[PDB]
């Protein structure tokens, strides 16, 4: 026969391999495809869809509908945060379960720009200006508008365009970040503040909710496929 010499790797089974193998049902008449709507070609397409953030994971609000609602009110102006969030899209508990967070938990590395969009759900009569902030890592995380203003931000004026978007631009030392909590590849701080205050007339609710959404920009990518911690099978 043709002289051959068996190399290392011979007879192993690598679950990531890509070889040919014999067909157990030869000449099978395959059913043709039909043009079903909603075909997906790449998981990042799903990461670019806005999904809603469970911002308020307090002991009584978590795992209920309330976790998605961020309560605002018409109280006097303060420089104190409405919310504070770490830019760790796969590991921060508020981001890890969003569709983006979920897909990122099947990969080791992520890179690219993200965007946060907030929806005001108070009455038409309610007005207000808010400041949405992104502080790249390395300094004290912002707890006052004074610090948050110095970073990347959008001052949102509430009105007919119900929603506002802040883009978190890819600003990183490394070319990809890890999808776990890691200081070396930390992403920084997302926060929201009152710029002026929510103002309402009489006969109007004085408290209301905003909802927030996160999605990936067209420059966003992931790599090194891995199993997720978000599902298990005990026994």
């Amino acid at each position: 026969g043709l002289p051959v010499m068996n190399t290392p790797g011979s007879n192993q089974y690598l679950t990531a391999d890509n070889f040919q193998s014999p067909c157990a049902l030869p000449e099978f008449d395959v059913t043709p495809p039909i043009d079903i709507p909603g075909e997906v070609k790449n998981m990042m397409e799903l990461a670019e869809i806005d999904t809603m953030i469970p911002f308020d994971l307090s002991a009584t609000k978590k795992n209920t509908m309330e976790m998605y609602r961020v309560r605002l009110s018409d109280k006097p102006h303060t420089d104190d945060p409405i919310l504070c969030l770490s830019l760790s899209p796969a590991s921060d508990p508020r981001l890890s379960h969003t569709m983006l967070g979920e897909i990122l938990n099947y990969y080791t590395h992520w890179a690219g720009s993200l965007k946060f969009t907030f929806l005001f759900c108070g009455s038409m009569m309610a007005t207000g200006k808010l400041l949405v902030s992104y502080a790249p890592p390395g300094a004290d995380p912002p707890k006052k508008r004074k610090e948050a203003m110095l970073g990347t931000h959008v001052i949102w004026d509430i009105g007919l365009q119900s929603s506002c978007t802040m883009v978190v631009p890819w600003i990183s030392n490394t070319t990809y970040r890890q999808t776990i909590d890691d200081s070396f590849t930390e992403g920084g701080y997302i926060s929201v503040f009152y710029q002026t205050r929510i103002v309402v007339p009489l006969s109007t609710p004085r408290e209301m909710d905003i909802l927030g959404f996160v999605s990936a920009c067209n420059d966003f990518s992931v790599r090194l496929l891995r199993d997720t911690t978000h599902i298990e099978q005990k026994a």
Binding site: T7, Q12, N105, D140, Q178, S183, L224, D227, Q233
Partner: protein
């Protein structure tokens, strides 16, 4: 266009000299090495040089598999105070010393990594008994994926992690991995910290190890015997060999001169005397 296997330069014949040209005199303060060749300070003949530097190209210098770890597993009955032994290893070249010293001639590197697995087993108890041929699962779990807690738990399902199922007594297992670094090159040395200590924060909260970057840099290999246990005990070891293929390196460094002492550049007291006695005027 000069290749690694090209012959080095010929020696050109040179005769006596008496001039203001002074090749022999120099000044090392400048930071430069004097580029001399024999014909600059002695009379030479013409020689057609055939030797080449082919074996000392960066690729050729590294073109060898080196052992980076030995993992131990067993196939024993799990019992209330002791479970069947599976192994977990943090991927690194710093648990052994030889490949580590070679890579550390340089500050940074890029390479594709070839891993080869040699697997050996033995009986540990006296009894006669037997075991049937073992199959091993070598699962890569990258930073963030669930590390196995028991030899038989759900994580060994590997829907996304790469696993090798190796059959005992067959050729040593082998896979390749691309350049997987999150930087443009691997850093053999990182003069920094992964955290900035802030004043407004407790010291504990800002603390981090010197020279360490990502806590789980590359993840782990988890290895198990897939077979159920035998009445007789069998212990196995998986030796891992790493070869850097398609390699590039930057910024040369003096090699390690005293024994390694941990993953950093630290040294141990009592090991700091590499050099031996030899008299100045003794050949």
């Amino acid at each position: 266009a000069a290749t690694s296997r090209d012959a080095l330069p010929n020696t050109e014949a040179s005769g006596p000299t008496h001039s203001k040209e002074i090749p022999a005199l120099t000044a090392v303060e400048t930071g430069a090495t004097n580029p001399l060749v024999p014909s600059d300070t002695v009379q030479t003949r013409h020689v057609v040089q055939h030797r080449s530097r082919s074996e000392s190209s960066i690729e050729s210098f590294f073109a060898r598999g080196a052992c980076v770890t030995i993992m131990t597993v067993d196939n024993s009955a799990s019992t209330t105070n002791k479970d069947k032994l599976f192994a977990v290893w943090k991927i690194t070249y710093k648990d052994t010393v030889q490949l580590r010293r070679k890579l550390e001639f340089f500050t940074y590197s890029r390479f594709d990594m070839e891993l080869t697995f040699v697997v050996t087993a033995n009986f540990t108890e006296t009894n006669n008994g037997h075991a049937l041929n073992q199959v091993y699962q070598i699962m890569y779990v990258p930073p963030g994926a669930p590390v196995p807690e028991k030899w038989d738990d759900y994580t060994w399902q590997t829907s996304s992690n790469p696993s090798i199922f190796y059959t005992y007594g067959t050729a040593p297992a082998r896979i390749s991995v691309p350049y997987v670094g999150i930087s443009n090159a691997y850093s053999h040395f990182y003069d920094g910290f992964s955290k900035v200590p802030l004043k407004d924060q407790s010291a504990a909260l800002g603390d981090s190890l010197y020279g360490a970057a990502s806590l789980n840099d590359f993840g782990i290999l988890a290895v198990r015997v897939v077979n159920d246990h035998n009445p007789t005990k069998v212990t196995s070891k998986i030796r891992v060999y790493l070869k850097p293929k398609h390699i590039r390196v930057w910024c040369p460094r003096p090699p390690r001169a005293v024994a390694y002492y941990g993953p950093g550049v630290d040294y141990k007291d009592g090991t700091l005397t590499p050099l031996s006695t030899k008299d100045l005027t003794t050949y």
